[PDB]
Amino acid sequence: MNLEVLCGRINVENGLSLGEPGLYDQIYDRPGLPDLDVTVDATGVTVDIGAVPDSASQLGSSINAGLITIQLSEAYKINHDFTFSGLSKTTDRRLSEVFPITHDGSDGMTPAVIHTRLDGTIVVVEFSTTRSHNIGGLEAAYRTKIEKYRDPISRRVDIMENPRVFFGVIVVSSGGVLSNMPLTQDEAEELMYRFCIANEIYTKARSMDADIELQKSEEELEAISRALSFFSLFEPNIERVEGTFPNSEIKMLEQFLSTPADVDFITKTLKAKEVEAYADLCDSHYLKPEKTIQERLEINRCEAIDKTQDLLAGLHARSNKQTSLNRGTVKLPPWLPKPSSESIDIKTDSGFGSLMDHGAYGELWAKCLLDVSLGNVEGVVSDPAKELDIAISDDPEKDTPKEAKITYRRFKPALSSSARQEFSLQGVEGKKWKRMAANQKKEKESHETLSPFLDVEDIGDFLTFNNLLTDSRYGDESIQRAVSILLEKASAMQDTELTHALNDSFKRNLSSNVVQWSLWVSCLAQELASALKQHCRAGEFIIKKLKFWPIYVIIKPTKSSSHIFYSLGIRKADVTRRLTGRVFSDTIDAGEWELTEFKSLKTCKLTNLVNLPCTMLNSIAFWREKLGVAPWLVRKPCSELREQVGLTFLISLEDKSKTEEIITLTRYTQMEGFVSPPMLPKPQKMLGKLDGPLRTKLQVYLLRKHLDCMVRIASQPFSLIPREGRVEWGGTFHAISGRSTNLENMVNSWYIGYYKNKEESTELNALGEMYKKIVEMEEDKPSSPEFLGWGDTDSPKKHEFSRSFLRAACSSLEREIAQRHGRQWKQNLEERVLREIGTKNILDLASMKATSNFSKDWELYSEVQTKEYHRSKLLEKMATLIEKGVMWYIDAVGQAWKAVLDDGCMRICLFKKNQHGGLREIYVMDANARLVQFGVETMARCVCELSPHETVANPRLKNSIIENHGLKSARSLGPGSININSSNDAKKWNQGHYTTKLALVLCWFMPAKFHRFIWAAISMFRRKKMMVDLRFLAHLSSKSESRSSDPFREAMTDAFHGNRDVSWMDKGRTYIKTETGMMQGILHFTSSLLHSCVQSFYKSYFVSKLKEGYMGESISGVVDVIEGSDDSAIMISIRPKSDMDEVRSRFFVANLLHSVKFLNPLFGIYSSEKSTVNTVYCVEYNSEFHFHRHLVRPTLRWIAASHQISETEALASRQEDYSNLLTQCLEGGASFSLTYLIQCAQLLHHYMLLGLCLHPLFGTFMGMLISDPDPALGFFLMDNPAFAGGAGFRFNLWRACKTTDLGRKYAYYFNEIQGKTKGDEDYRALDATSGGTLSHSVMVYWGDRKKYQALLNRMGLPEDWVEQIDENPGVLYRRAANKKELLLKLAEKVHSPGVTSSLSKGHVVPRVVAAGVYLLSRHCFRFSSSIHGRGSTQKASLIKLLMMSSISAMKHGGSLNPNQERMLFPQAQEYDRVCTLLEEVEHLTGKFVVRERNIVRSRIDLFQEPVDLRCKAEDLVSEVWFGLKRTKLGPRLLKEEWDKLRASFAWLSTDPSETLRDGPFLSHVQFRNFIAHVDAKSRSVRLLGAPVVTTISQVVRMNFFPGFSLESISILKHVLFMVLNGPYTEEYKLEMIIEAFSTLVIPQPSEVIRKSRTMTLCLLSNYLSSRGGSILDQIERAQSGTLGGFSKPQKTFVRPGGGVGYKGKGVWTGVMEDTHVQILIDGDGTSNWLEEIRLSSDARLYDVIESIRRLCDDLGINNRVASAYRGHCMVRLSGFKIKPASRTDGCPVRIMVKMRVRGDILNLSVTIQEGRVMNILSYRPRDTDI
RNA sequence: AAAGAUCUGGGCUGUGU
RNA sequence: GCCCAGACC
RNA sequence: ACACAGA
RNA sequence: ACACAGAGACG
Ligand SMILES: O=c1ccn([C@@H]2O[C@H](COP(=O)(O)NP(=O)(O)OP(=O)(O)O)[C@@H](O)[C@H]2O)c(=O)[nH]1
Ligand SMILES: [Mg+2]
Ligand SMILES: [Mg+2]
Ligand SMILES: [Mg+2]
């Protein structure tokens, strides 16, 4: 590389330009490393570098062989010196000899390079190296090198004339280069290679003599020393290990590391597997006897048809063989009553007698209404006047009844025995009627599965033809009016035309039939959730009415884990409309009434019904966007929209696991359509996963449609369409409906099953399947151990593997690791591992996760049957270990291993994961096994960190390998390359891994001193005792005989009862014993290491095979591999050069990507049928779908989770949670308008959770909210429709403060907080007070504090932990040293609000849903007394809090002043900049465009963190107070940074006690928390779109809607853009601009209070015409342009040469945007600086400040000099940034004509002083003007 | 009830009388 | 760092 | 000591 | 009505 070319290829502008940091990955093929011969003879270090081994990439050609000497005192800098030798042969250059002499302390600072071009451009280049392995280390080094030199260079820039400085940085690591230089890829690769040799030299020189390196920290040495002592003195008693655990002989390990791999066996096995794979490929894809593709596709169709017919027949043979029944998919009636006025009364008169003679349900309803209309049911008529009196009660606890709720709306009907029988058939008091014959027969029939040939055609007709999307004409009813009022009040913040259009679209969606139905269904679900706690005696029912609808419900509650029964009733006159379709359950005709049979719902099933309206609204909006229909368009629905919305409806309502599982499998069924020749699609491979019981009509319908999809795929693959430079696919369709659609629509339809609720509760009879999943794998254990680590076999069975192939895979991975990290990688790995193990603390293991309490005392069921098993928290065990005195993980793991070995097993307990896509069992260890597992997983993570393609330990490799395959193939093969990929998954990954293989793989890469620990610690995995549920085992114990078609159920019964002997269960035991398999994710990283080894072997083998060729000549190819845990992908790129060679090369590559299935069992890995093999131009990895240059992300996945019912306790934290959910929908691929509609649904959800459909006082509450829109009191804030979900909740809170009456309330809160002293009541620090603190002032608690208090009483922590921390503050800044500091840190952890709220709350979603009946009127909210004031009691209702705010906080006059706005919202200036950028899109105007299909992830940075400190204030305070070298600065820079900290906070001192007694903080923990957050935030949103002050504008324009662009004078703009960018000179350009302003006509200007380019053009149109008169008056009235002049000119002086300087105290006075501005400036002969800013008003401070920045930009005045004025102002300006008025490092801000063309700049200006020109108007042409 | 991990974002019968 | 949420294994 | 180097 | 190739719940 060359420094001159690299520095001369930079485009530099005036002033200092940092640029943008670019990242370079190690992509290109690398030659072998040269030979190194390092000697240390104490006369320096002599390295004998040999020649680079022969290759052809021109990489490594900068390394010259021969002797090199590097002195001992210069040998600690080798990595820096050798890497950059050739880029910069020199060493350093001071700033004194290139820059003007400043008199700071920085004149002696030496950046690596200071280059100077011929014109005068200066490039300051800094070099850096890091030995880290992640991007974080590169970012840290880049940031510290920028921080060290940015400020002094800028100070020198101030005093230069015509300066152009860049200041680039290059940071080099092993696998990355981070630099803002325009480096080529080859230069970065060369730097990485040179760094590899340099680090090899450095490691060798350190190994030979230990004084080359530098003295490292005491803590690092102690960590390394304790780790070394542990691993040297650890004796696991391997003889006892062998006698205790199966196959634990260490002679296996000794043989594995010393016996080389059997080369002949490997070659013979590889040939045999090759011919077996070829035979399988030829037989199963019909390649011989050489037919055409049509005939082979027909044979594929016939095979698929036959196999699906076998499936259907086998499923029918075990069913009840009924071809017709009446069983509704939807258990709710299709009623659409017109909504009525708010009422929850049960007023009923007259007709009861006709109801009596209409069956059992008519009898029940008539008796209920008769009892209601006689006064014997309490609370039938609500009183929203006494409830208000309770709500406004100044004295709770005395005027709220306690015992009224006992008889609330409860009636006890005297039903006949026939009616009780009928109701018991539905489960209503069904346990008592269990032995009656009808109940027995119904129970017997309930277990029978359904036939696949069942008539299900009402479902298909409903899906194609329904009235779900018809307008209901209910748009002016009460629920609509309430939601509309709340939405319009929220939208008054951004009351524009876009807001109105999107609100109208939302309200049209809200007025559809399905949403109106979902609204009352959600209200019914909320009433049932309320009835959960409303206990009923025997025979007692509850009668309720829905608030907005004439619907009555009779409810029978049970135990809260058991069922809720309900019956519905309406008047037939009240049924205005109905939902069409035959998917609904039949109702009952009862004369005047329509009734509903008793249906059941559990707690988990309620959620989907609660969220149903938001689900349906979001589905309608999403599928309208995906069909290309704009939100602002009225259009009748097509068949596809009806099908999608109806399918979502049915999936949400059925809420069953098999239903969503069938839909989930369609993804793997339909991915076979991308399989390329010479292979055919085989979607019939999924037929094994569709075998299972069918229990609903929808399951039958979905299975049949899935099988039709499978037959369709098997006969016709998706077609390739390459047209211009992209690859498109044709023939895609929805799997369920069958209708043709886009690729993205098919991918999204693969996730419709996600609408089923994950959080179901599993029943006891469903719990045995888990045990079944564990047993047959253990039953497949080989009876002989010869192929479990000892020998070699070519035909391994289950759990078996061959030693030679495992060793060869380890060798291959070791070769790749030695290529990347050098030949001394293991030496550095040892130091890394010892550091990690010795540093790690016991409190680091004190997590919030559960642990197993299973032990020897729980093993025998006869001693346990009366007990209840409970898991513990790991925090308890770790706290017990800390109290006893253990402080390091080293001192605990020895005792943990001793306890495990004495136990002889590992103790596990089980549970079932709540997941989509099927069944997964989950294992929980006890604390001893966790302590042992932690060390081996640490070592495995450290090894996986070194792998060049393992993605679990290297997150960037999730993407970089896939998207760098194109560059690598383009370099190696040229253009026009064919890419063939395979995406592979493994079958039962954790269950198939015998842990001896994992131990051998891990011990291959670790140094021998760890081997004794690794072999023993994994050995305990070969005897695992797994506790089963005690209730399941209790029901099993009472049934010694088995009546089941499942063999496992009988086997388990006999094993527990002793009737048979099996290896996994003994008689009368509570556990299953298992030897095979790791557990789920327990040995995650070592299994990733094994898979990395295997795929490294595959890559090497594929490369060798491609080099061999098919008939002798090599195939040119590029092979890439990527690995997860069991997930893998292989990418092979070829260029065949002709048509005839292309067929042969593709056949060869298909054969290579067909034998992975056959080579995997040699490593104990089994290919899953979820693997998609041999697909051209497309690859999938961890559900990331790369379809050539189209990255497809399933947006429906995140849209389905956008309205989670939050468990949070603060009211505004609900809106923060909603915003966090919204951002993920935005990043998942949704447009901005879709995100806004999703937020409208979130608003509806939020007000439902506040009691919109429940509380009779919600109207009063809403009326109070209109006059007080406080988010802390429940007001939902809506986003700007053009940028929805992109800014966050704090930005919207700042907008609400700046716009609504929340500013007055926050100003009052600020004044009340500022007025108190430290000893005062309700005092809090104003410095630690932000807008988020004020919004978090109202809370409601959901958990039980008694559980948390009992947990505290079992831990023994000191009560005066705050005082003991105050005695020793240093405990809050570094690790503990003794028992005392660790106990203090533990007590600090457990008393944190997050830990307390986590250990208090369990599952509280039903309580949150049922709180809607009492949040408004009952005193359950705790409020901050520092903010809301002392109340009469500690708790209040929401209406009470609104009145308290209405009498105190709303009386305060005046909004926030700029100082308060700056303190509460530190990022307010960036907020205002973005908000100004957002107000140019206020109208729905634009054009429909082409979507262009090129889609990629791209990050958008906004609200960027300003430049204040070099380091974090945490580290600076730590270093100054306690001597910890947490920063990277010398004493001069450390003192300089401490000066800026003290400038920010004058009370800060070098003594912690002085700061504690002089600051605003009562305790020192509070100061630690405050100093943790001095730097506020930095927000970046990762959009998914076109391959990109400017970028925000583009994404706002191009992402409002897919295929839409949101936009005489514009013709003038189009002319001027080509004029100012054209190849002309100033003379020729000046003519036709005047000509264009003399031809075209421009509207006359007006008064605007924002920046408009149009009226700026109008002003120059009038200037060139001189119509009105003086141009200055026109500009003054139009209020666009800086006007004014110097009221005190500076003394003008001649600089040495040709420059002109100023020295006096000049004063500028003028107007900038309707504001009188007086600027005071000074000078010293080198620069000029601001002294004071005087403004007559602060209404538009931010715009005025930006105008001052532009005014000082061209006048050469800098805001870098601090003023000595210590008086009072409103704000201070430092670097043209607004600061709080208490700051002491900026200037105070206090209250009180010719036209030119610069470079592509068009300005109107006037002279101000001699040798000084200032602008008035500027217009910059933009690329969007054409 | 909620294991081992990776990313990204954020935070620091209270019952309807 | 700690806690929370979502997605992924 | 200043100025360098930085898992 | 929920669960389930009849292992449970319906107090
Ligand atoms: O929630 C999870 C998901 C995945 N994993 C770990 O990731 C492995 C692969 O995750 P997987 O989703 O492929 N399931 P797998 O066990 O392979 O069976 P199959 O359905 O046939 O593919 C699993 O074997 C676990 O070890 C977890 O530990 N926890
Ligand atoms: Mg340097
Ligand atoms: Mg798998
Ligand atoms: Mg997987």
Q: Is A705 a catalytic residue?
A: no
Protein A867 CA to nucleic acid E8 C1', in Å? 19
Protein A350 CA to nucleic acid E10 C1', in Å? 36
Q: CA dihedral defined by A61, A63, A64, A69, rounded to 10 degrees?
A: 170
The conformation of residue A1114, written as its DSSP 8-state character, comes to: P
Q: Alpha carbon of A159 to those of A103, A120, A1726, A1764: distances in Å?
A: 12, 15, 5, 22
Nearest partner of A399 among A388, A383, A408, judged by Cα: A388
Measure CA A401 to chain center.
46
Q: Measured CA to C1', what is the nucleotide nearest A74?
A: D5
A438 Cβ contacts chain E strand, under 7 Å: no
The conformation of residue A860, written as its DSSP 8-state character, comes to: B
Integer Rg of chain A from CA: 38
CB A773 within 8 A of CB A967: no
Nearest partner of A1311 among A1434, A1474, A1446, A1455, judged by Cα: A1455
Strands (E), A108-247: 113-116, 122-129, 164-165, 168-172, 176-179
Task: Identify the nearest ligand to the CA of A1080 by its number.
Answer: 1
Report the C-alpha gap between A191 and A3 in whole angstroms.
13
Nearest partner of A202 among A194, A128, A24, judged by Cα: A194
Strand C: positions under 7 A of a protein C-beta atom: 1-9
Confirm whether residue A209 is marked as ligand binding.
Answer: no
Site of tokens 């080369």: A263
Q: Quick one: tokens of A1675? A: 């500009």
Q: Quick one: tokens of A164? A: 């152009």
Protein A553 CA to nucleic acid C5 C1', in Å? 35
Protein residue with the closest CA to the C1' atom of nucleotide B3: A924
CB A127 within 8 A of CB A88: yes
| Amino acid occupying residue A915 | Q
Q: Which atom of ligand 1 is nearest to the CA of A1127?
A: 13
Protein residue with the closest CA to the C1' atom of nucleotide C3: A1394
Protein A1222 CA to nucleic acid B12 C1', in Å? 22
CB A1484 within 8 A of CB A1600: no
Report the C-alpha gap between A667 and A1169 in whole angstroms.
12
Strands (E), A687-764: 719-722, 727-730
- Ligand 1: which residue has its CA nearest to atom 6? A1081
Report the C-alpha gap between A1239 and A1219 in whole angstroms.
8
Q: Which atom of ligand 1 is nearest to the CA of A1126?
A: 9
Task: Exactly one of A77, A89, A145, A1105 is catalytic; name it.
Answer: A145
Give residues 830-849 of chain A lying near strand D (Cβ < 7 A): 831-832
- Ligand 1: which residue has its CA nearest to atom 27? A1081
Report the C-alpha gap between A1783 and A217 in whole angstroms.
37
CB A1506 within 8 A of CB A1576: no
Give residues 829-858 of chain A lying near strand B (Cβ < 7 A): 847, 849-850
C-alpha A1534 – ligand 2 centre gap (Å): 18
Site of tokens 């190819």: A1117
Give residues 1482-1541 of chain A lying near strand D (Cβ < 7 A): 1525, 1528, 1530-1533
- Ligand 1: which residue has its CA nearest to atom 14? A988
CB A580 within 8 A of CB A472: no
Protein A46 CA to nucleic acid B2 C1', in Å? 60
Site of tokens 């926030």: A1456
C-alpha A1168 – ligand 3 centre gap (Å): 6
Task: Give the method used.
Answer: cryo-EM
| Amino acid occupying residue A725 | G
CB A862 within 8 A of CB A855: no
C-alpha A211 – ligand 4 centre gap (Å): 48
Report the C-alpha gap between A173 and A135 in whole angstroms.
9
Q: Quick one: tokens of A627? A: 């069909």
Per-chain residues with Cβ under 5 A from ion ligand 3:
A 985-986, 989, 1126
Report the C-alpha gap between A998 and A949 in whole angstroms.
19
Confirm whether residue A35 is marked as ligand binding.
Answer: no
Report the C-alpha gap between A1346 and A717 in whole angstroms.
62
Strand E: positions under 7 A of a protein C-beta atom: 1-11
**3-class DSSP string for A1410-1450:** HHHHCCCCCCCEEECHHHHCCCCCCEECHHHHHHHHHHCHH
Q: Is the peptide bond before A452 cis (omega within 30 degrees of 0)?
A: no
Q: Alpha carbon of A1492 to those of A724, A1497, A1584, A1770: distances in Å?
A: 11, 15, 13, 51
Nearest partner of A1206 among A1176, A1245, A1177, judged by Cα: A1245
CB A1795 within 8 A of CB A1771: no
Residue numbers after which chain A is interrupted (C to N above 2.5 A) read 1588, 1607, 1792
What is the secondary structure of A1773-1814 as a DSSP string?
A: ESSS-EEETT-SSSEEEEE--EEEEETTEEEEEEEEETTEEE
Report the C-alpha gap between A470 and A486 in whole angstroms.
25
Confirm whether residue A985 is marked as ligand binding.
Answer: yes
Report the C-alpha gap between A1676 and A240 in whole angstroms.
94
Residues A53, A1100, A1008, CA angle at the centre, nearest 5°? 80
Residues A456, A461, A466, CA angle at the centre, nearest 5°? 135
C-alpha A1173 – ligand 4 centre gap (Å): 15
Give residues 1205-1244 of chain A lying near strand B (Cβ < 7 A): 1216, 1220, 1223, 1227
